[PDB]
Each structure stands twice: as structure tokens, then as C-alpha cells.
Amino acid sequence: LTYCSTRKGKRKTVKSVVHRFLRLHSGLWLRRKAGYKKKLWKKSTARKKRLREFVFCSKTQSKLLDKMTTSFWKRRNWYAGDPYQMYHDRTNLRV
Amino acid sequence: KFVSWKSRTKYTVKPVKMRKSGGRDHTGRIRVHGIGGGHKQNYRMIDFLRFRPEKEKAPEPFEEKVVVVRYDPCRSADIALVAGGSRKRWIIATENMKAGDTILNSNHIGRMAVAAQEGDAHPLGALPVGTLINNVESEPGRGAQYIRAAGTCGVLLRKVNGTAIIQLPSKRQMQVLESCTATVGRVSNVNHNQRVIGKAGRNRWLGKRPNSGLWKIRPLPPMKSYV
Amino acid sequence: SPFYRYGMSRPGSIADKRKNPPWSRRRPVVVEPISDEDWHLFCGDMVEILEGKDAGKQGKVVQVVRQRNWVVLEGLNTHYRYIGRTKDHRGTMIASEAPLLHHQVKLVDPVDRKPTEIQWRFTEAGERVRVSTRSGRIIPKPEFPRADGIVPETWTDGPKDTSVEDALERTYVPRLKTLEEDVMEAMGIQETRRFKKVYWY
Amino acid sequence: TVIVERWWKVPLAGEGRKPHLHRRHRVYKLVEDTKHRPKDNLELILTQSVDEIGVRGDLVSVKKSVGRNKLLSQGLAVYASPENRKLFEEEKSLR
Amino acid sequence: AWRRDIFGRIVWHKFKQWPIPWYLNKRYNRRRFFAMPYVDRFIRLRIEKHARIEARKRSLQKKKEKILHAKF
Amino acid sequence: RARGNEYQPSNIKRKHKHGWVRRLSTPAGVQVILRRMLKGRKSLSH
Amino acid sequence: PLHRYPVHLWQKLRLRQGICARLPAHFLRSLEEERTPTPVHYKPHGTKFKINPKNGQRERVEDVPIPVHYPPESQQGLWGGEGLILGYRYANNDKLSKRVKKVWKPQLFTRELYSEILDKKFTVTVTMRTLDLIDEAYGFDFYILKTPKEDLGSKFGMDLKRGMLLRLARQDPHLHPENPERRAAIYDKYRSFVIPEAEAEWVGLTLEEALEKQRLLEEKDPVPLFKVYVEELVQRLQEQVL
Amino acid sequence: GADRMSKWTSKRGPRTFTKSRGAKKTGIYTSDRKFVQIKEMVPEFVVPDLTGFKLKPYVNYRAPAGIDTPLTAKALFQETVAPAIEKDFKEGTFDANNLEKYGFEPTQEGKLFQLYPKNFPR
RNA sequence: AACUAAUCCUAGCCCUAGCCCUACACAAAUAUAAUUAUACUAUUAUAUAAAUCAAAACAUUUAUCCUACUAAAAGUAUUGGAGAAAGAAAUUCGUAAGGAGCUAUAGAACUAGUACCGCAAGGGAAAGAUGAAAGACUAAUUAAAAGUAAGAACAAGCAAAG
RNA sequence: GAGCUACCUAAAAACAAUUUUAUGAAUCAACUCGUCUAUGUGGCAAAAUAGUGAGAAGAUUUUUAGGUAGAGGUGAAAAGCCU
RNA sequence: UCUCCAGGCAUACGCGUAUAACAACUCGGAUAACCAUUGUUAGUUAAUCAGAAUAGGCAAUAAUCACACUAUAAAUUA
RNA sequence: AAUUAUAUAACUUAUCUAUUAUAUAGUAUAAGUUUGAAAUUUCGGUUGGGGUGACC
Ligand SMILES: [Mg+2]
Ligand SMILES: [Mg+2]
Ligand SMILES: [Mg+2]
Ligand SMILES: [Mg+2]
Ligand SMILES: [Mg+2]
Ligand SMILES: [Mg+2]
Ligand SMILES: [Mg+2]
Ligand SMILES: [Mg+2]
Ligand SMILES: [Mg+2]
Ligand SMILES: [Mg+2]
Ligand SMILES: [Mg+2]
Ligand SMILES: [Mg+2]
Ligand SMILES: [Mg+2]
Ligand SMILES: [Mg+2]
Ligand SMILES: [Mg+2]
Ligand SMILES: [Mg+2]
Ligand SMILES: [Mg+2]
Ligand SMILES: [Mg+2]
Ligand SMILES: [Mg+2]
Ligand SMILES: [Mg+2]
Ligand SMILES: [Mg+2]
Ligand SMILES: [Mg+2]
């Protein structure tokens, strides 16, 4: 990671995270399942269904991704007609 | 700082002092190995253009008188001082040249064959097929460059139209115009190949440093399991 | 040299070359710089000691070390020492004067002897003269014997000394001729040859 | 001439600035070599009558090598500039 | 004349007497009154070196007057 | 053999190898002098 | 410490002090101005905007000229802006192969060219591009006169321009002598490029050549102060007499 | 181990190395190594007659020194040239061409002692 | 009851601010084996910075190095063995002599590019201390370091502890 | 950086006596080299001393000035030498 | 004066005042005497020793006591 | 060994000249191919230690 850049003196985002994961404003991260486009002919129908899903990340994985990206990727984005509009907040969470 | 010693513009019969190279070039680096030291030598300016008419004289056959046949440190053959008119010039000596002999230098291209006497310079057209010749020039006026070593004689195999074929000492056939001038006979010191050096010091007298003590068909793919 | 310290002994004397050797690196003395115009004390001027052992006693200046802002008064600020001490003999006791800084003394009005501060101002002729700050008055420049010991009035020239009138005789006649040409004409030298061309470069 | 193209993108520098180049911007590839382009013909107005081309004043299209080497150097033809066109056109009309 | 030497400095050159013109003398033509471009860096280094000395010199005088004013 | 006496003095050799005229012969040698002048050396060359 | 001015401004400050200041104002403008040569070794972008294919959005584009090395041998000929491209290539045209030093060289020919204004034939080292430029300019004389210094890029070419401009400026009767009619035609053909005599003299001069010219013009031996004082005395005496 | 700091003189180096101590040449070396001294090249000391000379090395301390007024071209011109030109101008016998009449020299060439470039020693 | 020693304060230096410069100083000598008064033998930079290093190896690649106004747009668009990393622009904003620095192993290497080392390129030190006055005889101050002296030792031992 | 060392270029030097012959012959000095043993091992010496030895008119040895330079030079190859 | 040892004198190269006298007795010589050390003053003398005009024309025949004598590695501005 | 290789050498197509009836010559350059003087980089693991094997 670049912690202090030569030109701007800031941290830098790792653009490998930006191209693989989606961050919900609450703090969660979504990802795909590795291998979901590979050798589908020899995979069982149940296995393929599991692969197609969007899945959450663990606490430590989320902690790592937060370190690898900057604040701009953590802001609240007001997109019209967003399909993740309802998933940016947690409800009935006591914990 | 290497300035070549070959800086004399004008011909003279006085021996000229030579500076040795050592196998190195003007850069100062060895370009040929095995040359170094030896005896000090003087260069006698040889003249290989046999038919050179004297200054302010007509271009026709002339004759010259052999003063002495001498040893030359700078070549295998031996040299003969020849005088004619008011001019003295060093030349290469044939096998049988002696002092007091007379040798002709002919420009005339004999329409018929001219009897060949060793030591005389005649155009190849004049000479008959088969005559042993030496000091052959590639092109008329160039000067002799081939068959200039000791006892080395080439044959004149053929003459057709304006050109002739010469068998060089290496058995390599060369072709030249019949106008080119070739001396008749062998080149003298025929026994040079019989000389024996005897001791390692003798080569170090001739400027020959000792040899260094340091002591390819790629197979085609189809034939690599048999190498 | 930046480290040469000025002392009571004259520069270049045997004592000075021992007090200030080439290898000495003593700490600089801090001197309040005083302009050549501002400085107003001169040899032979009577001054009064404002403070010290002899405060209130008027004296005559006899030496000035301007680099140290020192004025030395004859017979005042005196301590005692032995001069000419030898192994066999003690020497002679004498009173030796010590330097006094300018701010520890003041000049004295001639007619009324008091420590009058003075100010520099020009005159009708234009010559710069000291004037008393109070009781405005001309304090004349005193006359002091020459340091080398030469008194011009008593001086009588011996051999090898040009006489006055001869030194003041005017013989120069302005003309557009160099010293070289004048001497040759006067001495009658003749030269008709001329130098060949020279390419200066 | 030889025309080259950089392998690496050069960031924009702005209106009144010059881009700072790096060692990687010195790597080039060959877009085109003008030597191998199809060669256009040269148009000249003759000032004389020369065999196999035409009479004085005509307009012809000839290989550049022929035009420079012989016609223009020898004075047989003149450059078919608009000014030259007008002069020779007037002569033909009067003729 | 004012001339620039091979080290890039400007120096007054005092002429000498010769019996032949300058374009014919071969000992004079070996002397060079120009500097090649590889001297440009050294020209800047002299200016910067001199600027440092003068800046130090000004700074010291300012400090010395502070000592005087405190003392007097 | 005993080493340490690799220096066999010769004024002709010395002035030819490291002298003023030698240093000025090539541009690299001129820059040798320029460095030493900038450093302040009392001896620019032999 | 710091320099007062940035190092890039030093050349401008040098032109503005000393004998450089006394140089002609018009000559300094040529020295001061910097103009990019017409593109030769790269294709310029036709527009100032393009549509990025990957993301399908409009993005600005700029032209960055290739660095080209001009050997001093080129200054003795007429290369039409061409030079040496000193660069690197990727072996096999894949960036995952080794990076290899590459030099692209112009094809140089020797050609003889005739100048009407000078009435002389020169033998010049030339590129096929240079010949094309002359053809587009409808004459060798037009090529030199039309092409600017940056495009011309040759000290030999610039000297030709000064001679041609000086020839036209003075209407020198040294051209095709004994034929005023033939001469008149040549001067008339190139009348568009006529400029004042004073300006034409300083065309194509380098800074060093210009400085020597200026030093020669103002070089003068001192006035013997005998004359100077004599002038003053006479003026004072004459004024008193008045 | 050679000494880089001491001056290079003819005492140092081999016999072949020789160089002068600053004495001016007085002759020429011809071929076959013959030295030919030239009489004109040898300086001549022009000494005046000091008999009856009133000036001695030192001066009276009683003699007043004078105010320094270093000579200037104006002062030289006024003392020497002004009297003639002024009188001549009143007489009207004046022109720019005849400045030589008052002592002006257009050129220094041909003079034994030239003021520039100087061709004589002190 | 003292030897070796110790104490010391300013020589200068450091970072900024400000500022284009016009310091390039007698005679003579000097590019010849420099510093040698005159002929001989004439005189002239450089084609792309590389590698280390980072990528936990290395082989495309690796900020600054290889400068073009500040703050923001923005570590965003983009670029990349799409890895390590790299990274804009449109656009907007912008009127101005000092020290919570050093004080002789510190601060400049500097008392000096000297001494000295090296054939050469090159490397490169150490140190000073009276007082107002030395035309007052060059002072004082300190059980104070290790080391010694004054004053060798006296069965038995991590040398002390009870 | 080739004042050491490797090789080279140019200009110079040295070799008595004795026997063979007519010599990279013999005995053996000067000179060159460094076989074997002892001493020495911060030594006299960062390779020496004392003895004993090999060559000693030659591919000998020595002197002076010049040349070849590190991606290189030189090498009767020891991966030797290039302060 | 005696006892004993057996590379010395010049020049080249190099070094650069170590030269000589006096006065000193700290430092230097691995100790003393005395000085090679410190300070002061002096010194090395050259027409023979040593160093530092132009343009053309032309050269066959070593050295070694140079005769005899052979030879081979073929060998000095007039 | 992998990756390269306007070191030299060769050919081929252009480019530029000469000629010629289309044609054979050459060539201050570009693009290929062949040759390889060189250049850069590397030396997986487990196995009293070394052959081979093997194994991951
Ligand atoms: Mg072998
Ligand atoms: Mg912007
Ligand atoms: Mg050594
Ligand atoms: Mg030696
Ligand atoms: Mg790495
Ligand atoms: Mg790399
Ligand atoms: Mg310090
Ligand atoms: Mg220090
Ligand atoms: Mg103690
Ligand atoms: Mg006990
Ligand atoms: Mg040598
Ligand atoms: Mg013998
Ligand atoms: Mg023998
Ligand atoms: Mg023996
Ligand atoms: Mg034997
Ligand atoms: Mg050997
Ligand atoms: Mg071996
Ligand atoms: Mg070594
Ligand atoms: Mg003595
Ligand atoms: Mg004594
Ligand atoms: Mg002494
Ligand atoms: Mg002599």
C-alpha cells in the first residue's frame, strides 16, 4: 500500500479491491464466488446456484478492504433508482 | 602516436630504414599475434612495374644491365640491381639471373610468338601458351602483385581473343588481359622451402614471437535422439 | 589578522610581537564603534576623570589607542611596577599609567576649568572646530610633539638634506613631451632609427 | 519519413503546460513508413515540346522522378501553379 | 582585451609583441579563448558558491551589531 | 620480492602524465581541473 | 539560499541586459518566440476531443511531439524537418518481451538544386520529404522563403533565406547581369517576400553571430581627448563672442 | 612522492630541462649553435651629469608640503594648449585642420617614443 | 597538604525572509614539461543516462531521480506481469528582518580544502581560553574522572552481606 | 592509473679468464635467476638474511623515452599480470 | 699512535639545503659524546664540463684491430 | 537453460539512381528472414552425504 504519495501526500486506493467488491454504507462488503464462470459443464446444478450468488465478507476481510480503499469509496451515494438502495442500512440489529 | 614509416614519396635505390610494428596498429592494440623484435632491417624500394620507360623517353622496348643480384631481408626472393640509361632501380631477380646479364623490357604486343628468354618482361599476348611466368599484374599498368615469392612460377594456360588464363602457384586459375606484362622464368631461391630453422632462437631473429599456451554442426530436430 | 589585540605597547614592538604572536586566538574585545567625526579627544587636551581612583582629577592626554577607545593621561590612573628588573638588581619603582575609556572622561573648558561636553561645528573659514555644548566656545586644537621626536623648528639640516628654498623652487614647464623625450634633447642623444612593425596580440 | 507512436499513455498537461515525459514514454512502435506509401504523380505545364509527353503548354501528370530529374532541371516544364496556369491558358486562347 | 578562458571565466588578456600576424602564428592558435558547453555546470556552481559566502557574511554582521546593541 | 617501491621518480614522466599541458589536452582532463578549482585545491596539477 | 529568478527565466534575463539589450528589437523577437515545428514523425490528433471506447465517454486529447535528435551534419544540408528518432522498441511488438534500443534514421540523398534569386546551383544533402515540400511550394526559392526557421531547421537553409531576402531587398543588379528584363521577372515573381533592408540583414543569425555583428558595428577607437577639449573650448569661446 | 607545491625551476629536472629566471634576451642563436649578441638589444643606462645639483635624498622638515592635486588631462590641456588656441581664436588664425600646430599628433607611428602601444621601458 | 587533569565563551556556523547580477581588482609572467619577453608543431562537449532498489525471486513494470504556480476537483477518471504500483485534465480559488537554531567531539570538513595520505583522479584532520591594563612579570578557580602518589603485602577463596 | 608488472616500439649499453670450436657448446666470475635447508615470523625485510645452488655471446641481461586501460589491456595459459 | 675490516672515486637519474660556521641543548638520532636537531649567518662563479636561413638534385658495396676470412639474423648530418 | 540480439555475414520486398525493353544492375534508409559476436536473468522441495532414480 502507498501510505504517503510523492505528489499528493495521501494514501492510495488499491484498484484491485475497487474492481472486485461493493461496499454498503453500513460497512458490509459484497463479492462473487471464485470459479462461478469456470467449467460449468462438470459442476452440479446445486453447486452452480451457490456460485451465482452475491455474498458477504467476514469482519477481518472487511477490515482489510477498509484499509486498502480511501474515504471516497465509503461515502453515501444517492443514485436514482439504485438497486442497492435498501441494503445500505441495517434494521432491527441489536448486537 | 603511431606514424607509419612508409612516408617516402620519391623513388630511390638507397636502402630506407624501417620501423617495426609488433603486430599492433595505429590504435596501439595488437591486431596480429606472433610478431615482435628480430633483427633490424632496411627497406630497398623495389619496382614491380617492369616496363617503366625512363623520364623524357619514348614508350618502346628498352634494355637494362644487371649490376648485382643481392640478398633481400624483406622477402623470400632475391633482388637484382639493374641499370639502363641514367636510371638505377631494384627489381626481383629470376632463377638464373647473374651480374652482367642483359634483359629486355618490351611493350610491343607480338602478333606472332616471341622466343622467351628468362628474365625479360613481355606482355602475355607476346608469350606463347605454356611458358612459365612470374610477377604478373592483374590489369595493364597496375604493377606486379602475383607470383612474387621465391621459386614460385605460374603457367599461361590459354589465350583466346583479348584475354588469357593464368594458373597461379596455388593452382587457382586467373584471367587477365593479354596486354598485361609478365616476367618469364622462375623467381629464384627455389630452395627456400628446403631451409631449416633449427633452433627456436632463429625464429626470434626473424621477428616471430612464440605461440600462446592456451590449449559445430547443430543437429536438426529429427536427428537429436541419435547424437 | 582578526585576532590581533591592541595593547598599550606600540604595534610592531618586541613586546607587541610577543603579546600578539601568530598563533594567539584570544577572545575579541567589544568596542563601541565611534565615527572619525564623532571622536573628539586629542593628544594634549586636558581632561577630567569622571570616575575611578583619581575621579575628579584633571590630566593631559599623552596617547590614544583609537582601536580600543583608549585615552591615556599623564600621571593619573597609576599603578606601581618595577622597570629594568634584572637578576642581580630589583629595578626602579615607577608609576605606570593605565588606559581610560572615552566615556570615563570629559574635555575641559579652558577659561573655566570644568568638564564641558563639546559638539563639532564648522567656522566662518569653514574649518571644523569643537564647540562646547554649554558656554559655546572654541576649544583650540592643541600642539603635541611629533611621535618620531622630530621638532621642525629646532631642526638644522645636515649633509644629504635639501635646503628649504631649493625644495620649493619651481622648474616644471608644462609641455606635451614625456620624460624620455626631454632628457634625450637636454643630453643631446640622437637616434634616427625607428622600430619595425610589431603585431600586438 | 518514419511516423512513430508511443506505447504508453501520456497524462494530460492542461492548456498552458507541457507534459512531463518519463523513460517509459521513449518506447515506440511504427505506425507507418511513408517510403512505402503509394506514390502520387506530379503535374507540370510544359515550356517546350518533348517527345511522348506533348506540345508546349499542355498539362500532364508524370512520375515525380521523371519530373524533377529531367523536365524541371532541364527547363522543359514549369510548376503547374495557379499563376502559371493563368499565363499559359491565356497564350493558348490567343493562339 | 576582455576574453573568456577555457574554464568559463572572464579575464583581461594582456597582449604580447610578435613579429608575425596572429593568423600565421601557430603557438598563439593553440591558446583557446572560449569555453565548451561542459563548463556550464561549473559556471553555476561558482555563482552559488559565491552567493553562500556573501549570505554568511551579511548574516554575521547582523549578529555582531546585536552584540554591540546589547553591550551598548 | 620486496614490494613498496613501485615509485621510480622521473620528472619527464611526471610532467607528461599529470602535467598542466596533459590535463588540458582532452575535455575530461579539463574537467579534472575544474573540479579541483571548485574544491579550492592549491595544486591543480603537477 | 535561493536564486531570485527561476532557472528557466535566466536566458530571457540574459537577452535583456548588456550588449544583448542593444541588439535590434525585431531580431530579439525571433530569439524570444518558440514555435513548435510542423509534425513530421508523429500523427497529430485531428480533433481536441475523442470518445473513449472502453468507458464510452468523451475525453480530451493532446499532441505530445516525439523527441528528435538533429545531428550537426544536418545543419549543412536541407532536411525537411526530419531527424533521428532515438527510442526503444518491444521485441515482437508485445510489452511482455524485452525492451530494445532502436534508432530510426532518415534516408538521405545528394541532389543538386537551382535558386533563381541566387542564380546558382547547390549540391545538398536532402530527404524525399524535402523534395516534396519544394514541389508543394512551387519552387526551391519559394520553399526557403515560405518555410519558417522552426520548420526549416537548418543553418544552411536559413543562410539561403537571408541571401534571397537581401537579394530582393536591395534589388541587386548582380542577378543575371546584362538582362534587366530577365532580372525584373525574377524579382517580380517573388515580390511578396520583400522586406526592409535593415531587417533582412539579421535573418538567420545565431545569438553569437548576432553579437559579433553588433560588436563590429559599434566598434570605435577612442577620440583623442585633445579634440574633445578643443571642441569644448571653441564652443565656450564662440558663445562668449556671440 | 614528488613535490607538487614548490616552484618549477631549471635547477629541478634533468639536464635537458632548462628555463630562464626572467632575464631579458640580448641576442640570437644561429644554426650550428652560435650566440650572436645584438648591441641594440642590450639596455643602455642614460645617466645625467649630477655636478652642481642642489637636490639631495632628504628634505627639510621645515619645508611646507603641498596640497595634492594629481595631474589631469584638463589641467595639462589648460596649462599648455589653452593659451595658444585662445590667443589664436581672437586673432582668427584657427581651424580644425591645423591642430598639429598646437602640438597635436594625429598618429603615433614614426615617433621613437610611442604613447600607445608603449614601445619604451621606464 | 598533589601530580596527571578539570572548569570556561565566542570564533564561526544553521534555517528562513529579502534581493537578479554588472568583485572580473597594482607592474610583470603564464596553456611551452603552465606561470620561461618573439615565429618552429596551429586550435573544437555530447547521439536515448544506467544500475542499484521495489515487485519479498525475476524477465514488461518500479513515485522522486527525469521541475513548470498555489488550494480544490482527487488519490477521482484513467494506466498496469489489471500485480507491485502509477496517476491527470476540463473547472473553480488566489492583491502578501527573524529564531521555544548550534556554542569548540556541537554548528560548515574548515583556524584549512591546509598539514598529511595517494603516481593520479581522489581522500582529508587536529586545535583556542588571564586581566580594565602585561608600558600591571601572563593569571585564577576545583575533597572533584580513569591513572598515580601520600601509604607494598600478612592462612581462607565473584571479594560482598549478616 | 602501464614510473610496479605483462607485452610491444625507438634510441642506447654490458659480458673477464679458460677450453671448444665456429656454438640458444663447456668450466666459471661480474651480472640475471631463486633449487634445498636453517634462521627470521610486529622480523633488517608487509617475502629478508646466511649458506647452498641454476644460467652466464644469448629466446641473455640492463638503461632511457613512448604505446596498449577495465564490457578492456597483456599473456612461451599460471585464469599470471595491469602500483 | 695502535689493533683490525675491505667497493671506493666520479657521472647519470633522483632529491631540494640534509651543505659550512657559530650559538643553543626543548623537539629530532631509537642512548650518550656529538650533532644529521632548533635558531642565525654564509654558500655552487664556465665561450672548453653540461643544457637550449631558404629551395632543389642524388645515394647498390656493414660490423667485428677490417687485411686475409668466410658467414647470416643482412646491419648509419654528407 | 529461458528471453533477446540494426556484432559480422547473407539473401527478400520496398525506397532512390542508372539503364533496358519489361529487364538485369547497384542502394546514406525502412520492413522481414537466416547466421549468432554478444547482452540480461535464473539455479523449487523432501530425502546418514554422493550416482540414478524417484516422490510433491
Ligand atoms: Mg599448445
Ligand atoms: Mg488544472
Ligand atoms: Mg606505495
Ligand atoms: Mg624502473
Ligand atoms: Mg525484487
Ligand atoms: Mg529491469
Ligand atoms: Mg567542528
Ligand atoms: Mg570537523
Ligand atoms: Mg582520582
Ligand atoms: Mg574470608
Ligand atoms: Mg614502461
Ligand atoms: Mg667471456
Ligand atoms: Mg652456454
Ligand atoms: Mg653452473
Ligand atoms: Mg649448464
Ligand atoms: Mg613471458
Ligand atoms: Mg592450465
Ligand atoms: Mg594491486
Ligand atoms: Mg653539517
Ligand atoms: Mg655544537
Ligand atoms: Mg643545522
Ligand atoms: Mg657542450
UniProtKB/Swiss-Prot annotation, chain B:
GO terms for biological process: mitochondrial translation; translation. Keywords: Mitochondrion, Ribonucleoprotein, Ribosomal protein, Transit peptide. The keyword Transit peptide applies. Its main location: mitochondrion. Disulfide bonds: none annotated. It is found in: Mitochondrion. GO terms for cellular component: mitochondrial inner membrane; mitochondrial large ribosomal subunit; mitochondrion; nucleoplasm. The keyword NAD does not apply. Signal peptide: none annotated. It comes from the Eukaryota. GO terms for molecular function: structural constituent of ribosome. Component of the mitochondrial ribosome large subunit (39S) which comprises a 16S rRNA and about 50 distinct proteins. Belongs to the universal ribosomal protein uL2 family. This is Large ribosomal subunit protein uL2m. The chain holds residues 62 to 297 of 306 of the full protein.
Swiss-Prot record, chain D:
It comes from the Eukaryota. It is found in: Mitochondrion. Coiled coil: none annotated. Belongs to the bacterial ribosomal protein bL9 family. Component of the mitochondrial ribosome large subunit (39S) which comprises a 16S rRNA and about 50 distinct proteins. This is Large ribosomal subunit protein bL9m. The gene is Mrpl9.
UniProtKB/Swiss-Prot annotation, chain E:
The keyword Oxidoreductase does not apply. Residues 62-72 have a biased composition (Basic residues). Signal peptide: none annotated. GO terms for cellular component: mitochondrial inner membrane; mitochondrial large ribosomal subunit; mitochondrion. The keyword Acetylation applies. Its main location: mitochondrion. One of its GO terms (molecular function) is structural constituent of ribosome. It is found in: Mitochondrion. Keywords: Acetylation, Mitochondrion, Ribonucleoprotein, Ribosomal protein, Transit peptide. Transmembrane segments: none annotated. GO terms for biological process: mitochondrial translation. Belongs to the universal ribosomal protein uL29 family. Component of the mitochondrial ribosome large subunit (39S) which comprises a 16S rRNA and about 50 distinct proteins. This is Large ribosomal subunit protein uL29m. It comes from Mus musculus. The lineage of its organism: Eukaryota, Metazoa, Chordata, Craniata, Vertebrata. The gene is Mrpl47.
From Swiss-Prot, chain G:
One of its GO terms (cellular component) is mitochondrial ribosome. SUPFAM superfamilies: L28p-like (SSF143800). It comes from the Eukaryota. InterPro entries: Ribosomal_bL28, Ribosomal_bL28/bL31-like_sf, Ribosomal_bL28_sf. Gene3D superfamilies: Ribosomal protein L28/L24 (2.30.170.40). Pfam families: Ribosomal_L28. Coiled coil: none annotated. Keywords: Mitochondrion, Ribonucleoprotein, Ribosomal protein, Transit peptide. One of its GO terms (biological process) is mitochondrial translation. The keyword Disulfide bond does not apply. GO terms for molecular function: structural constituent of ribosome. Component of the mitochondrial ribosome large subunit (39S) which comprises a 16S rRNA and about 50 distinct proteins. Interacts with OXA1L. Belongs to the bacterial ribosomal protein bL28 family. This is Large ribosomal subunit protein bL28m. It comes from Mus musculus.
